[PDB]
Design a binder for this molecule. Sequence first.
Ligand code: HEM
Ligand SMILES: CC1(C)[C@@H]2CC[C@@]1(C)C(=O)C2
Ligand SMILES: [K+]
Length: 405
Amino acid sequence: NLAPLPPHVPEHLVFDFDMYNPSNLSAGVQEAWAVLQESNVPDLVWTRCNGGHWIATRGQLIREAYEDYRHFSSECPFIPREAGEAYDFIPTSMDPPEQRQFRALANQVVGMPVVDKLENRIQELACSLIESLRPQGQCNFTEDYAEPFPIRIFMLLAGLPEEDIPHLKYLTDQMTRPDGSMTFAEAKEALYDYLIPIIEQRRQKPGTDAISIVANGQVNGRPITSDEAKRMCGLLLVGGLDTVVNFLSFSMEFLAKSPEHRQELIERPERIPAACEELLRRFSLVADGRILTSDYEFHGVQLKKGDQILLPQMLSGLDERENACPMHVDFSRQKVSHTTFGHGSHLXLGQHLARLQIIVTLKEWLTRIPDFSIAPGAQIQHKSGIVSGVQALPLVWDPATTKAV
Ligand code: HEM
Ligand SMILES: CC1(C)[C@@H]2CC[C@@]1(C)C(=O)C2
Ligand SMILES: [K+]
């Protein structure tokens, strides 16, 4: 239900948006969140859902809050409070000064030099999967590509067996879009239960994989601890298993529904990177937040120490104050403004990997299957959370229109 309204919150600021089951979900997730930017809604609102918390609804406030880590701490970055309290991943649960030293280590395993080394295998995997689907004239895109394409690459990078994917994917999903079977704390402890023996093993006998690299790594010139390594490796798993996996499906749902936009990319494939950026804006999908370190008056609103504030990364690029006609996809948009990969000191460090995976998927798919549609009669369902997603995406095409390459 709705948590009782705290005394310090004026009733005129109440807007009971449920980030885990938003009212207008049937219209699309981004559409469902964009209700927070309707004409009657203030820049900063209180929702009584999910224990009660603030929501910044506009790009300007979201950006300002991500910059001000002194007032807006990452210590408790998830809603609901019990999830944010249990959340201890590194670097995300940390503020400067201590946070930054951990970013360099994470960059060693998923940063640009690593992405370069993996790029041929990434390309190869996309081609392999797509060629196998091509003659079928149909797929369940979420499970036939959106999942295995990013996840098998992450498993390879981390040196984990592919048979472990269903278990790990289940756990990650419970931390971002819980189905009610597990609390965040339970899913976290299970993920750590998995990692503990692996980290011990790889500190004793290091390999070349990501976990070995992190577990035996150094931070600001001193050895990382087993526990710090566990808390970082957990985060890396969530990133590899539950980000681009969802994003690809939003993109592909859009392309199937939009023949005019596909054709643009078939006629002019060099536009694909710009298209990637515009889609990252339009189908932005992350929303986490921060906790107030002290009482603070922010844009005329009295925020109280300990208050949680959702700062939906998703909303910045959908904000008409940041981009004209924001629900329209324009691959030639001149200034594509978004905070899809975050803002401030916690900027996504997986973004080279993410962009490569998106760009590769678009290029390799459109080359082989230029003409495809949503299965006739299908209604695409979505699920909202910390990272939002597509429940299923049945696609169809005429094999005669495809090219084996
Ligand atoms: C479309 C794909 C992705 C999106 C939209 C995305 C989004 C984000 C966002 C919004 C943040 C900031 C969180 C915050 O400020 O609290 C973040 C941080 C982070 N992301 Fe990504 N991400 C994506 C892919 C990836 C991938 C593939 C990885 C690979 C491991 C990854 C690893 C990380 C890490 C390690 C951080 C923490 C940085 C820090 O706290 O200093 N992300 N990401
Ligand atoms: C918000 C994120 C996308 C970012 C990387 C994975 C994620 C769910 C986190 O816990 C930090
Ligand atoms: K915490």
